[PDB]
Curated annotation (Swiss-Prot), chain A:
InterPro entries: AryldialkylPase_Zn-BS, Metal_Hydrolase, Phosphotriesterase, TAT_signal. Binds 2 Zn(2+) ions per subunit. It is found in: Cell membrane. GO terms for cellular component: plasma membrane. Belongs to the metallo-dependent hydrolases superfamily. Phosphotriesterase family. Its main location: membrane. Zn(2+) 2 binds at K135, H167, H196. This is Parathion hydrolase. It is a peripheral membrane protein.
Amino acid sequence: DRINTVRGPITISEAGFTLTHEHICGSSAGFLHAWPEFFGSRKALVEKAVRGLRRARAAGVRTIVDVSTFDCGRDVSLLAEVSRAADVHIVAATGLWIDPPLSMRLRSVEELTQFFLREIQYGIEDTGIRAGIIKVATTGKATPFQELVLRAAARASLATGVPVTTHTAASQRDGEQQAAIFESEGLSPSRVCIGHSDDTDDLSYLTALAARGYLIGLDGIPWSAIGLEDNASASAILGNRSWQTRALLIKALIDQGYMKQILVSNDWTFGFSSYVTNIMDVLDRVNPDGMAFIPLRVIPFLREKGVPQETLAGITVTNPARFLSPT
Amino acid sequence: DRINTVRGPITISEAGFTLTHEHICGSSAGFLHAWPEFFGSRKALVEKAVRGLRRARAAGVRTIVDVSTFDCGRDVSLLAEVSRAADVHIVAATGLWIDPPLSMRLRSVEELTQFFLREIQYGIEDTGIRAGIIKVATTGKATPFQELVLRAAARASLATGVPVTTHTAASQRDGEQQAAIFESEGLSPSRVCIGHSDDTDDLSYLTALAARGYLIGLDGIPWSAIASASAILGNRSWQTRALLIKALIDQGYMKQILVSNDWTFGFSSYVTNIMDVLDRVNPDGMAFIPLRVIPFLREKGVPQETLAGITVTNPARFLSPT
Ligand SMILES: CP(=O)(O)OC1CCCCC1
Ligand SMILES: CP(=O)(O)OC1CCCCC1
Ligand SMILES: [Co+2]
Ligand SMILES: [Co+2]
Ligand SMILES: [Co+2]
């Protein structure tokens, strides 16, 4: 009984192969409840999620960390239903993403701390499901509110031992400002993952954060718009860098002695409403493997390039276990 | 069985004294469900709402129209519970307010029309409760998205007969631009209420819209401040806001007037403890219209039959699906 999942507490050894940054549904607070027909039906979304997670389990995945926050449309009852049906452990998140409502954005650092602590210690909504990770975000220079969220996340982490994971605009080196704010609150770098770090080729930025003890989130490996770059909306979110380029950053960080600081994921989803219509159809064509992309296509790629089996197992099993474990 | 309420359909006769622009709780989508301790507890908010609605009922109110939209934190199950315990009919709303999320603000006019139609024709969430009004908003010159919302609201109204009610920045005269968009869509002015119209003293703006067939929403009479409270309430007294009703009755537009309090029992979409400030400014709550505004208008010479026309007849005709 170490890490909290949507099905209850599980031991560290039960976690196994873990994908540290995933989503079942990328939405907005209350959206799925009010407009399930946007995703066909709630039933259709569940079935797609169950099929995808089952295919991921068949490939080796045993646990995923759903980093969807309140404002990213997190529906823990959906997470619970799909987790049980697919028999894959799902770790839920607290925190705030890039779209907080008025009721969240007018809150003080003390109130935000209480909200995060409530979702970790008491439970999310009336479900009794407790969060096992805190998700925060910046998109360039932090706004006065985003600073309060980072500080509240740090205080929530210090009181519970629960890790913090971030969304960054990696090209703008956001991880450095986030790191500075986290450390001013006394939070240990070993409890933080600087996410979306594969969105940049700046190895100097990645190694420096890794040297300080930060976990590096190389979480969007299948995101590439190569071939279909005519669609401005798809190119803006996927990027023009290949999956191989993003995957070679895993090799680059190992080669420099930071294998213990790497966390790999797909940043996949089965539903996506917080972007243009039919983006889900575009995503499923680019990567038909879904969450199964890491064990099926990335792990054999790194094995072909010379990376040993034990360090890859250490990246996919040992690093997430050490990160998610409350300390 | 024509007007949809949170407890099912009711007739025109059952509506009675109706407050056309009210809120049980002003929040954000999913907020009350995720953080009920912010309001003390869900039980505390329900109890405050029931006592508040019972006070309005004892003062003569039979129906209130909760204009809280999806993004304004509307929880129809809460509206259903408080309606039951207080024996006051509550009409739920669809539409979008000033805080739409990414999943709403990236939608086309066709998709927003489908959403509004869903809430009116099928039901809200999984409750089976259908909306009886469409709420929309502009805060000055309409943003490209706000134009899309106004058009989708008109299309949803034209397909159902359900009325449209608006939130305006009355000092910037949004009602004229809202009117132009509604008319371009083919929406009849008699199906539209230009709300927050009592935030301005410009009578020429109100009478011109009323002459075109629009309903004028003089809905924030208790909102007066005579830090962050002064920015939302304003430096104008309730008597000045109430005299605008008489000024419109005199200009011959008693049939175009809709009066309300724009009150709430929970408010999370603003600064903390804003409720303690509001409850001291107006301890009458939703009962402010029949207890303070109606006797004030009676004192100024306005007959009981035109006041009964404004509070009973006008809302029934407005809410009736046509
Ligand atoms: C900008 P980010 O990729 O973290 O958010 C998205 C939410 C919907 C699923 C894909 C991810
Ligand atoms: C500016 P608006 O009329 O939406 O103010 C409302 C006050 C009551 C809570 C919901 C907001
Ligand atoms: Co993500
Ligand atoms: Co308003
Ligand atoms: Co209002």
